[PDB]
Symmetry: C2
Subunit: 176 residues, 2 copies
């Protein structure tokens, strides 16, 4: 027997923003985000959960894309994950900028749902208050620039339950 918060949701313009405890590998959405090394050669923390669930093909696709010229992120299909593409981002880079780019990729490909982890709050060592604020900053910016987007649902999947209430505190500063 146990008692604890598991999810918070808010509406920001046309966008539903969700923060919930989970394993992002179980997600059934258009786009899943992987937070990884600059070189895309990591299989530990959230990258382990994603690369193992996605399968070997995705993993080999990553090694190809990594050794040829690329944006800050690379994109692969989902493999055995119940998603269409995976966007692999470096967890050490500016999170607001990373999430703004993720959201813009989603929109331009006409995807409707994206789930991401708490980027940078594991091995990257970034301060989790700042990371929640940055992710929220990026969603508010995107929403304020798009009054009728295809991307309607953004979720942060939280693995460390301790971060759930950090994310709530940052959400609540926006609430009316």
């Amino acid at each position: 027997y146990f008692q604890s918060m598991t999810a918070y949701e808010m509406k920001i313009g046309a966008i539903t923003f969700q923060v919930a405890t989970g394993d992002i590998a179980t997600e059934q959405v258009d786009v899943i985000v992987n937070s990884t090394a600059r070189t895309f050669n990591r299989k530990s923390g959230v990258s382990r959960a994603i690369l193992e669930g996605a399968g070997q093909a995705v993993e080999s696709e990553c090694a190809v894309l990594a050794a040829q010229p690329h944006r800050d992120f690379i994109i692969t299909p989902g493999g055995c994950l119940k998603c269409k593409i995976i966007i692999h981002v470096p967890g050490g880079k500016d999170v607001r900028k990373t999430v703004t780019s993720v959201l813009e990729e989603c929109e331009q490909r006409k995807y409707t749902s994206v789930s991401l982890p708490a980027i940078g709050t594991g091995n990257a060592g970034k301060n989790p208050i700042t990371v929640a604020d940055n992710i929220i900053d990026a969603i508010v910016d995107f929403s304020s620039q798009h009054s009728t987007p295809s991307l309607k649902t953004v979720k942060v999947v939280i693995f460390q339950p301790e971060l759930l209430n950090i994310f709530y505190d940052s959400m609540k500063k926006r609430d009316l």
Copy 2:
């Protein structure tokens, strides 16, 4: 354009407890709760939304059941609502007791989901802090008495957004 909290969720034992802004008439669950007069002869506030959406048949069923002997509540089918039964409860009675009975009816009929309004916080004039606490008290009691229930999902649908954060405050006192 606008920004606001819309949903909170927690786990209490085997039960998922959800509080979200909404019109309970749109709910697609096993059991919907109607908060009404002792005589079950009300069509105003949440009863209006429910009786209009359910249809005339449900409404006439209610008048029959009301004029013959009954428990504190009566039960009808859902009509045109996307639910199997409606449990009509008096919003002026002890809320903890009312919700304990609702939950016990759900379990014994092997239903899996129930949605209810903020019982008593409209025309009944009950204090909404106390009502949230009472509803939560009842869920914790039921959960602590049932380690493997059929009833797995309980939702409070909130129409007055102001009550959303009252419900959160009562939930957060249980969180670990």
